[PDB]
């Protein structure tokens, strides 16, 4: 049930999990909760989400609480300001350290507490089966 888009496969879960349990599910399937690194990818993801809330690989790292991608893609702060819902991230009750796709729109992301359970989206690069490149 993996959907293909620009060199990556994506898994849209049918069962809700916490942020970390979802990530462990993704890792068990040789993947990670999805990063988002372009306008077209965000569009593909929110359009496919169809108005439902999915955890993505948005989470906090460093002492600052800078946002990051659990798949280790460097987070581009400047290029990602267009992807949050206006007023987000707002850190409601000082306890929101994970991120989901919420609004069916380009401005779509929200921070929520990591312990809430939602559907989730895993992402994995297409890697062709090919011999030793050494």
Count of residues near Ca ion by CB under 5 A? 4
Q: How far apart are alpha carbons 116 and 72 in whole angstroms?
A: 23
Residue 42 vs 110, nearer CB to Ca ion: 110
Query: Shortest distance, CB of residue 41 to Ca ion, whole angstroms?
Result: 22
How is residue 41 written in tokens? 């990818």
Query: Shortest distance, CB of residue 51 to Ca ion, whole angstroms?
Result: 18
Residue 31 vs 89, nearer CB to Ca ion: 89
Site for Ca ion in 68-127 (CB under 5 A): 90, 92, 110-111
Residue 10 vs 97, nearer CB to Ca ion: 97
Tell me, residue by residue from 36 to 75, as one string, x for binding to Ca ion by CB under 5 A and - for no binding: ----------------------------------------
Residue 44 vs 85, nearer CB to Ca ion: 85
What are the residues facing 99 on neighbouring strands?
58, 111
Query: Shortest distance, CB of residue 121 to Ca ion, whole angstroms?
Result: 18
Q: Which residues bind Ca ion (CB under 5 A)?
A: 90, 92, 110-111
């Amino acid at each position: 049930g993996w959907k293909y888009f620009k060199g990556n496969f994506y898994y849209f879960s049918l069962i809700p999990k916490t942020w970390y349990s979802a990530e462990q599910f993704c890792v068990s399937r040789n993947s990670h909760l999805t990063s988002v690194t372009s306008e077209s990818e965000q569009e593909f993801l929110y359009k496919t989400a169809g108005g439902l809330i999915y955890w993505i690989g948005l989470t906090k790292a460093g002492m600052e609480g800078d946002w990051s991608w659990v798949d280790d893609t460097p987070f581009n702060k400047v290029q990602s300001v267009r992807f949050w819902i206006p007023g987000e991230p707002n850190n409601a009750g000082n306890n929101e350290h994970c991120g989901n796709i919420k609004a069916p729109s380009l401005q779509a992301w929200n921070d929520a507490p990591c312990d809430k359970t939602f559907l989730f989206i895993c992402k994995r690069p297409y890697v062709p089966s090919e011999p030793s490149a050494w």
